[PDB]
């Protein structure tokens, strides 16, 4: 398959779906360290942004080795955030619960 | 320190070797707070180093 190599630390992004049902798996469920991966049956939509609206300055370090950096910020400052539709999140978390109960 | 109450980013300035080897100029560039660490515990907490 065309594996997406995308890095992510605490949730998988843009991965492949599970075809028929929520599934749970681990090398050894008896011990905490072996991470209990889950491969969901439906996607959860996630959206993020950063509305500060930065701007690029250029600085000419040394012999022609330019270095970029955040210049002035035309706009108004705002927090950088991520959004998830809550009811779907609670539903899929609960269904992961039922499959965890199928294993626990 | 407090009138923002939102992650505004610092506004630091430094000296860079220009194209000439022994000429220099003052230049300014913003950095988000996690990239910058204070240099000493002195009351003069107005001299900073990159986290690297």
């Amino acid at each position, epitope marked *: 398959h065309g594996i997406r190599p995308v890095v992510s630390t605490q949730l998988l992004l843009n991965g492949s779906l599970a075809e028929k049902e929520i599934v749970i798996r681990s090398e050894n469920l008896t011990n905490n360290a072996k991470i209990i991966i889950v491969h969901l049956h439906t996607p959860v939509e996630i959206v993020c942004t950063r*509305p500060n*609206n930065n701007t690029r300055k250029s600085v000419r370090i040394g012999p022609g080795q330019t270095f970029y950096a955040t210049g002035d910020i*035309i*706009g*108004d*400052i*705002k*927090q950088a*955030h991520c959004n998830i539709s809550e009811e779907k999140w609670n539903d899929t978390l609960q269904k992961v619960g039922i499959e965890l109960q199928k294993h626990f | 320190v407090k*009138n*923002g*109450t*939102v992650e505004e980013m610092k506004n630091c300035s430094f000296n860079t070797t220009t194209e000439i080897r022994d000429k220099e100029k003052k230049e300014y560039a913003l950095f988000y707070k996690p990239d910058i660490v204070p240099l000493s515990e002195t009351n003069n907490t107005s001299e900073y180093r990159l986290i690297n």
Partner: antibody
Amino acid sequence: QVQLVQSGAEMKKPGASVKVSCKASGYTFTDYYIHWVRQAPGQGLEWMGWINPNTGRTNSAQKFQGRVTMTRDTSISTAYMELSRLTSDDTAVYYCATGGWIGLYYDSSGYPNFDYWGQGTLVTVS
Amino acid sequence: QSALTQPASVSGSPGQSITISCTGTSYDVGSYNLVSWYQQHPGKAPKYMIYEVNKRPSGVSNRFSGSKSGNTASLTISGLQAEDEADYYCCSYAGSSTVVFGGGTKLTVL
């Protein structure tokens, strides 16, 4: 409900400075932007500046930002216009107005949502 | 001068529809729905009528509506009335966190 009181008219000579105030009423001074537009007598309108009163931030116009040092204070519940190097052209009525709703996660200062406007008062100079 | 161009005046008898047009550029008004309309009857301060091209505040009847197209936008004035003899101003978001006002146009009831 909402009204905005402004400081009265005054006279000045060219090269002087002016500090017009704009006091709030009828709504929480924080949760809306505050606004200023300029109108020379018998002429069209014009824009001056924005303030997020919960901070010290300003968006002021390119032509007048050097000429403008507007500010605010929550204790008086008032936003202050300021002008310097005041030329004869600046003779005009200055209207204070309330902008879009302000909070987190987006910037509404661009929105020209002027729900309410102030008394408006005249600066004269020649 | 204003970035945004308006005609000097329009006129008509009561009971007839009238429309007015703003005109900017691809940037500024042309790129956003953030356009608004304000009326200045003589002497008093201006009045708030339309925001986001085609939405109304309270106290504005269904006589008024707006539209956008390209680098231009417009106001709709259906069924002119006797108290209408006042100016109308365009104003819109000019990018760069800045708002720009048009010179407006004078409507005259015959």
